[PDB]
Amino acid sequence: KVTTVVATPGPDRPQEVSYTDTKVIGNGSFGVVYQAKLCDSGELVAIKKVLQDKRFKNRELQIMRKLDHCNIVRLRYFFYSSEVYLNLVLDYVPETVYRVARHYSRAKQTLPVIYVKLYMYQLFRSLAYIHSFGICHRDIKPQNLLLDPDTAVLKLCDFGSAKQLVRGEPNVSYICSRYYRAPELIFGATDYTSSIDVWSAGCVLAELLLGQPIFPGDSGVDQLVEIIKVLGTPTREQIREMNPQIKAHPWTKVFRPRTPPEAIALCSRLLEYTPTARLTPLEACAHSFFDELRDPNVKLPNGRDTPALFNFTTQELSSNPPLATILIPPHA
Numbered sequence: 001k002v003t004t005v006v007a008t009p010g011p012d013r014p015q016e017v018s019y020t021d022t023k024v025i026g027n028g029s030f031g032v033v034y035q036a037k038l039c040d041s042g043e044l045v046a047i048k049k050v051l052q053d054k055r056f057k058n059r060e061l062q063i064m065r066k067l068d069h070c071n072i073v074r075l076r077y078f079f080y081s082s083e084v085y086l087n088l089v090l091d092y093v094p095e096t097v098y099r100v101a102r103h104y105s106r107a108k109q110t111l112p113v114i115y116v117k118l119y120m121y122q123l124f125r126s127l128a129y130i131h132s133f134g135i136c137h138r139d140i141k142p143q144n145l146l147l148d149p150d151t152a153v154l155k156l157c158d159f160g161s162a163k164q165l166v167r168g169e170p171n172v173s174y175i176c177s178r179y180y181r182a183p184e185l186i187f188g189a190t191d192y193t194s195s196i197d198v199w200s201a202g203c204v205l206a207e208l209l210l211g212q213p214i215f216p217g218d219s220g221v222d223q224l225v226e227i228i229k230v231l232g233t234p235t236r237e238q239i240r241e242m243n244p245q246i247k248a249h250p251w252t253k254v255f256r257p258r259t260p261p262e263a264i265a266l267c268s269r270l271l272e273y274t275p276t277a278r279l280t281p282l283e284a285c286a287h288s289f290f291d292e293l294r295d296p297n298v299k300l301p302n303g304r305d306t307p308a309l310f311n312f313t314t315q316e317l318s319s320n321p322p323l324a325t326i327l328i329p330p331h332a
């Protein structure tokens with residue numbers, strides 16, 4: 001059974017696109033996500049079908065049309081169906097950081113630090129890119145970090161919670177997946193910045209080192225109790241910057257004995273109560289935890305070369321251009 005639609009490439013000029021072998025792979029309040037095979041190339045795609053009101057633009061679509069980056073899933077096409085549905089057609093990526101982490105956790109093992117470095121570095125590159133446009137993802141979690149098993153390339157997906165943040169325009173605070181939710185959001189802040197994604201990235205890093213979520217809250221409010229158990233009660237000034245008294249647990253005692261000190265140091269500079277005290281994504285990319293990735297002899301565990309990690313555009317470096325001397329090593 002072949003379906004033929006008139007799709008606009010993600011130059012607004014539609015073309016006929018045919019696909020087959022459709023199967024449901026995902027769900028949500030937005031609608032359904034399918035996997036399908038394009039007829040000409042045989043390439044696999046993910047098709048996200050969203051119920052769309054004909055009165056007003058789709059925010060996810062407008063954000064996806066502006067993105068062109070190696071570490072973000074590419075919007076190949078979009079089309080309409082049926083009650084109108086918007087359908088986003090993206091290149092299919094079979095694995096995720098969530099599935100990889102779960103496999104290690106069930107086998108009582110930790111993910112090799114080379115993979116933690118490769119995944120986190122590519123996530124920080126995708127965030128430096130989207131943040132350079134004022135766009136905040138607002139749902140950074142391991143389930144939205146797609147991985148190519150053979151190349152170790154990471155791609156950020158699901159821009160359904162994303163938003164261009166404009167100063168003076170309030171934003172919803174009950175946002176982000178709970179375990180990865182920044183403390184200013186739990187305090188009800190509506191004037192938050194892109195640094196909420198950096199808190200989420202720090203939660204993903206800590207989870208990859210620990211083998212389980214660092215802050216496993218059982219409700220939106222208990223999420224703050226879980227955070228407090230580790231970072232201690234925030235001071236009055238920390239609370240002001242964001243929007244059961246306990247002393248902070250020492251960072252070295254949070255992680256396992258053989259955890260690299262550079263991973264702990266990076267984690268401590270991401271999981272800060274004060275949003276402005278957190279590293280920006282470009283600064284996180286320049287951290288000494290990623291030094292091994294800038295070694296000219298670095299290879300993936302399967303013997304292949306690592307993905308292209310140094311092809312930074314001017315747009316990616318725009319927040320701090322002098323960081324290119326650390327980010328692009330002389331051999332590249």
Ligand SMILES: Cc1nc2c(F)cc(-c3nc(N[C@@H]4CCN(S(C)(=O)=O)C[C@H]4O)ncc3F)cc2n1C(C)C
Nearest residue numbers: 025026033046048073090091092093094095143157158
């Ligand atoms: C809510 C949402 N919006 C999405 C979107 F815009 C694109 C994609 C997407 N997904 C994939 N692959 C995923 C590999 C993992 N599997 S699983 C958990 O093993 O069944 C789900 C599958 O959707 N590939 C490309 C995409 F753009 C996935 C999306 N999702 C969920 C399913 C993560």
